[PDB]
Symmetry: D2
Subunit: 336 residues, 4 copies
């Protein structure tokens, strides 16, 4: 009768998704990771450089991870096919390894026992959702596997939706100034598919490709062809900011832009898109659970039709919470 969750991979998104589940009362029945044994999972979950010590209890005993006295099964399978998901009640599975992105690859979870799969990363072919934008397009019959898109897409789409629906977006170009991540290197090292991403992450501003802005045009079809962008990786370990430069159809004096965002944040997009007029900086959004926080004082307009809009996101914490939100939402629709 209840929503139960299994997590594949115990990287940053895996661990932070478990925190978000504990916060929101969602029961996690198991974690799979081939390289991290239970006693080490305890340590990695407990201590976090970015988000502080876990605010409950974390122990292991009897080969089990134990979080707030909830016992969590631990497997060590190298391949999704091997995971005894049936042995833990066929949970919804979060697929967070970053290496099984296609519907096909992910589907090994289903063969193994998983009721649904949320891929915590963009997917080439799996259907893609952004809470607050298009979750009511989830089709429980035909969708056994979904993607929660990217952290960056989750920041941008709520905002794009609001601006477009109010003023119409003729065209826009996005920069995200983004914290470095686990895919980067501490000092100049090998990154043969993307040379810049090898260069030392703490020393450099690193230009990087991203599909995030374009992905927005998939969860918001009417923006097809009107959005793209790029990224600069900078030396901060978490929190990122969207810089959307857009041409708007209807006149859009900045006061009306502020009132539109405010109304969305107070109403339909509450808990997803937030609004602030404070003199904020990136660390003020560490631990923020919103997908997108509009920075009113930071944006600039050239005129009533050409504007730069600024929105923050905790690229780790916002997105992890949205994965749990998606799971909960899906579960409330799969009982039909």
């Amino acid at each position: 009768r209840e929503l139960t969750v299994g997590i594949n991979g115990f990287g940053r998104i895996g661990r932070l998704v478990l925190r978000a589940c504990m916060e929101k009362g969602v029961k996690v029945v198991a974690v799979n990771d081939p390289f991290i044994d239970p006693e080490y999972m305890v340590y990695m979950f407990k201590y976090d450089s970015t988000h502080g010590r876990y605010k409950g209890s974390v122990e292991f005993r009897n080969g089990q991870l134990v979080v707030d006295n909830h016992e969590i099964s631990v497997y060590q399978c190298k391949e999704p096919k091997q995971i005894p998901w049936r042995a833990v009640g066929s949970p919804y599975v979060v697929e967070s390894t970053g290496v099984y992105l296609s519907i096909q690859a992910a589907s090994d979870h289903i063969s193994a026992g998983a009721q649904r799969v949320v891929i915590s990363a963009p997917s080439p072919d799996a259907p893609m959702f952004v809470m607050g934008v298009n979750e009511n397009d989830y089709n429980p019959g035909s969708m056994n596997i979904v993607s929660n898109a990217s952290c960056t897409t989750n920041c941008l789409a709520p905002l794009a939706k609001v601006i477009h629906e109010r003023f119409g977006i003729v065209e826009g170009l996005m920069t995200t100034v983004h914290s470095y991540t686990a895919t980067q290197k501490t000092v100049d090292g090998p990154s043969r598919k993307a040379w810049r991403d090898g260069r030392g992450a703490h020393q450099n501003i690193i230009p990087a490709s991203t599909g995030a802005a374009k992905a927005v045009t998939k969860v918001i079809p009417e923006l097809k062809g009107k959005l793209t962008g790029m990224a600069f990786r900078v030396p901060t370990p978490d929190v990122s900011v969207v810089d959307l430069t857009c041409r708007l159809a209807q006149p859009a004096p900045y006061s009306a832009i502020k009132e539109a965002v405010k109304a969305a944040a107070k109403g339909p997009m509450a808990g997803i898109l937030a609004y602030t007029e404070d003199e904020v900086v990136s660390t003020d959004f560490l631990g923020d659970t919103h997908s997108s926080i509009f920075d009113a004082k930071a944006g600039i307009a050239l005129n009533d039709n050409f504007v730069k809009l600024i929105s923050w996101y905790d690229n780790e914490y916002g997105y992890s919470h949205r994965v749990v939100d998606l799971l909960r939402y899906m579960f409330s629709r799969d009982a039909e």
Copy 2:
């Protein structure tokens, strides 16, 4: 008969302008700074965290700073009026303290003995120059005091000039992702005129106002009303990047944008604007003496009329060299 230079202030721009003078064979006859005595000036000039040890010799003896066996007079005057510029041959003076920006304030140098003044910072009323863009607008009779604009304006204007003259700029919005500076704080401290700039510089992405993009519309009058922008201060100690989002009149497929920049870099803007197709990151421009380095692979286009252009600058080193370039240029025009 020769160009001689005096420097007021021995902050980063003061010290780096002296390096650029030594590099380019320009004779500096004196430095003024009330707080930094000669023996300490030796130390600060010799050792640099960002640009390495001075590659010549630096000593003091007989109350004098001595650089490469060129003896440099040192004064300790708190006010520009007091500086015996006549005592050192009425040099051209670089005014680099950041606190005498108006024609009026700066003119105290002239009362004190200075032939011309270059203000190494934007000025509200003083005439403003960007080498490669508008230096042939310098009027030797009426201009006793000029500003070399900002580091950021020197990055953007060469590029704007090229793009506008080739394709026409309808409108553009600029972000600079910029290294932190001396005006910032190591940890959250007081910045009552601009609250965000108080927050710890190494920990944060900090949105900030800048007049740089607008300043471009002053050295390039035909762009009046068509450019503005803003800044993010990020945790790197030097090198910054311009992200210009612009709508162009003439069609501007990216290949033609690349060919226009390349032609300018190879020709009229050689030594000012450079062009690269390498997989570069910010540290690859430490010590670069160009005002502006176009990053061909980093830019993105939505279509032939809406594009994001990326250009790097060593915000300390490029600008310091341009100050020396301005001085040399002015001197070659004041003998008329």
Copy 3:
């Protein structure tokens, strides 16, 4: 009938002492700072890059700072002698500006109506106290102005006491590997009294003098002449670590060293000195309220009489809580 506290200075220690007071239920009745008005105080207090958003409510009204609905008077006096401590009931005053350190300088607070003064920094002549080590030597009858020593002294002294009393320290040399602070510079800038300290804090490992080890011999007299030390400032914004290399008189196999510290932490020094065997790093102590956290696994012994002991401290947060603890203790003794 109850402790009330005035705080001179709203720098990092002033703001974080105010947090500690709210956490421990100590009434603060005024803050003085000539440069920071109430509205800006709200902002500086509410948002912290290191320690996060204040967990509670912060507003201004009626020229007052209001924290969790407790109203706090705000004065703007440049000098202690001018602050109307009498008008707010003659509280205990925390002198946190770092420029009134002698009994003579700090006594201007007394002459302005302060009941007592705690200097949140080493004093050349005021009596010095480390909670857990020597607070029992405070005497209300003879002492109206006291020093809470430094953050570093508060980390080493509790460890030195445990170790001296159990084994006897023959001699010891300390290094502290220490986060940068507000006295440092974002980029190479002026620091005429200590040239290294002007070099860019986030770029460098910076050797510095410190009297913290010698200060321990002031609060633990029997160690007179047996301890000194030095510091390295490194590119982290908070949390620091003591590295004590000492020769011990009695045999001291590491297992006994461990049982002695553990014993002190569970009993007489509980809340002051903590003990851990986990694989900790500096961020694991952000927000830690202990003065000193012994890291059992990080230390190393050459032999039974020559060992290197490692202890962590949040140099901001531990010290601030100790300031409040000394205030409460002093008040509990002033009822005599």
Copy 4:
């Protein structure tokens, strides 16, 4: 008739040993790395975030790496035994991958045709050499595989020798305050063998084990049992500093300590051990080719027999130059 060098591994030490070879005029005839092709080698070699652009020319052609017009063969073999060292004239081989450290593992290079092997890292069994300390113990007749020890061993050993020989070391404990390296992580990630080392390198001060101090007792036998140590990894990308706390046998006032190091640096250890009295910080040693730079002003003495001595090293650049120096020395002795 001349030294030729093959390099296995094009990681940081491989690339910087190649730089050192070009600077010192040592012919490199091949590089092996299974993962990095010639075109990517050109890029990794040409641009360096820490040490700047290669000062010279770098190209690829004909499946070769070409540096300052010297052609260098490139192999892509996963195993030493497979590299055709014979085909390039049986050079001396630098084993720089860090995973062939035993005589047995490194001897596969010999079986593949290498004349000699220098392991650029500590070896469990191969003979270990520090230039300036014990290179005189190398013997071509018995030794075809050698270790150049570690960066840290090369900083401490030259200082320990000078101090032991002048004063006698009774006992010593070392800390190295050390830049992060490629074995570390940008954000909390996996490190199952050393849990601390997986924690985010730029966020943390990280305690670590090191055998560097004990290794000094291998190259200076008379110090057997008299030295051990540990490390803190801190958020800088290069340059590190040894902090030696030692008890000395003969009286050793600091002025004599200073004259002993100065004497060694001007004479027998010139180019290996340097001496400075300036107010230096870590960035002042970027690109320094010494093994060890004694910092006179940073050290402190408790008394004539118990002192803390501080020495700097560029852990990348000094060590790399030492690898080349050992190669040249070995070759000068193989003509016997």
